[PDB]
Design a protein around this ligand. Structure first.
Ligand SMILES: CC(C)CCC[C@@H](C)[C@H]1CC[C@H]2[C@@H]3CC=C4C[C@@H](O)CC[C@]4(C)[C@H]3CC[C@]12C
Length: 134
């Protein structure tokens, strides 16, 4: 459940991310710095809401949401999206819709690490995070 994700995570490895970035139409200037930064993602629960903070040398982002309740999200690549995060078994599914398009993130816990899968059509990226000290 959500508890399993409530920790501080540090990005260690990214697979197929540049490809995915470019499928999204992410501009070059955001892309090249998105390939080298290793963000710190801090997930917690305030009341009944999940809070996701992201510390990065490019941008610091923060979002709050209740599971299943749609909300406006301005992504780090400046996409104004209608987003929904829900529980899917033991995984979190984050859906983003914008400009008639859609992309999805799947957060899971495999072997102690947080594995996040990003899908835009047939283009898929996988991002790996290790638990770090709070
Ligand atoms: C965080 C910056 C440097 C990345 C560039 C922003 C662009 C490419 C968009 C597209 C997909 C978005 C990402 C989706 C997944 C993650 C995992 C994590 O680490 C927090 C931010 C991050 C990385 C988002 C930040 C913004 C993002 C990366």
């Amino acid at each position: 459940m959500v508890e399993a994700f409530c920790a501080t995570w540090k990005l260690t490895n990214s697979q197929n991310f540049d490809e995915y970035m470019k499928a999204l139409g992410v501009g070059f200037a955001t892309r090249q710095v998105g390939n080298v930064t290793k963000p710190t993602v801090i997930i917690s629960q305030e009341g009944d809401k999940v809070v996701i903070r992201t510390l990065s040398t490019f941008k610091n982002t923060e979002i709050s949401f209740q599971l299943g309740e749609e909300f406006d999200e301005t992504t780090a690549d400046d996409r104004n999206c209608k987003s929904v995060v829900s529980l899917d078994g033991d995984k979190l599914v984050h859906i983003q819709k914008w400009d008639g398009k859609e992309t999805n993130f799947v957060r899971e816990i495999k072997d102690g690490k947080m594995v996040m899968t990003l899908t835009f059509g047939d283009v898929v990226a996988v991002r790996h995070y290790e638990k770090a000290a709070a």
